[PDB]
Amino acid sequence: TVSTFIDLNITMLEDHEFVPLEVYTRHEIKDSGLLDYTEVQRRNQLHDLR
Amino acid sequence: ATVVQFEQPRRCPTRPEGQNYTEGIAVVFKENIAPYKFKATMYYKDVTV
Ligand SMILES: *[C@@H]1O[C@H](CO)[C@@H](O[C@@H]2O[C@H](CO)[C@@H](O)[C@H](O)[C@H]2NC(C)=O)[C@H](O)[C@H]1NC(C)=O
Ligand SMILES: *[C@@H]1O[C@H](CO)[C@@H](O[C@@H]2O[C@H](CO)[C@@H](O)[C@H](O)[C@H]2NC(C)=O)[C@H](O)[C@H]1NC(C)=O
């Protein structure tokens, strides 16, 4: 068999899922400061009851 | 001796039926990072000697 047809190949672009990605979370940013003022306050205001 | 033939028509791809979508209203909630905030009144007396 010979053919008079001209081929053409089209495959659909497959699905692709995007997972959530973060370089730094806000908890790491809150921990970036050398002294979280709030936690220092809460610790130091327990001295009499401790 | 040598004898060839023409190729016959082909089955073309069916156009896919397609997706079905549900129409709706949506409200997206997130994690709360705001502290609970409430107003209060302080009573005290400064003393000095
Ligand atoms: C039609 O579609 C693609 C080319 O776009 C070919 O399919 C891939 O071929 C590679 C090798 O080139 C295989 O490893 C894969 O398994 C094939 N499938 C996919 C999804 O990648 C296919 O060969 C083409 N048709 C012809 C007749 O070559
Ligand atoms: C969305 O709804 C249409 C309604 O026509 C579905 O059509 C179906 O097409 C498939 C082919 O894959 C047949 O097997 C079913 O019998 C059809 N159903 C009806 C009721 O016509 C269509 O398939 C639906 N969505 C998906 C993703 O299949």
- The minimum-distance atom of ligand 1 relative to the CA of A14 is 20
- A41 neighbourhood in chain B, CB within 8 Å: none
Experimental method: X-ray
Which residue's CA is the closest to the ligand 2 atom numbered 22? Answer: B17
Atom 19 (ligand 1) nearest CA: A11
DSSP conformational letter for B36: P
Calpha distance A3→B7 (Å, rounded)? 5
- Asked whether B7 and A1 are in contact (CB, 8 A), the reply is yes
Q: Which residues contact A1 (CB under 8 A, 6 or more apart)?
A: B4, B5, B6, B7
Residues A13/A19/A24/A26 CA torsion (nearest 10 deg): 130
Put simply, whether B7 touches A (Cβ < 8 Å) is: yes
Residue A40 dihedral angles phi and psi, to the nearest 5°: -60, -45
Residue A15: strand, helix, or coil: coil
* C-alpha distances out from residue B11 to A19, A36, B14, B17, Å: 39, 70, 9, 17
Amino acid at A34: L
User: Which of B5, B49, B41 shows the shortest CA–CA distance to A3?
Assistant: B5
Give the span between the Cα atoms of A4 and B8, in whole angstroms. Answer: 9
First to last CA, chain A: 96
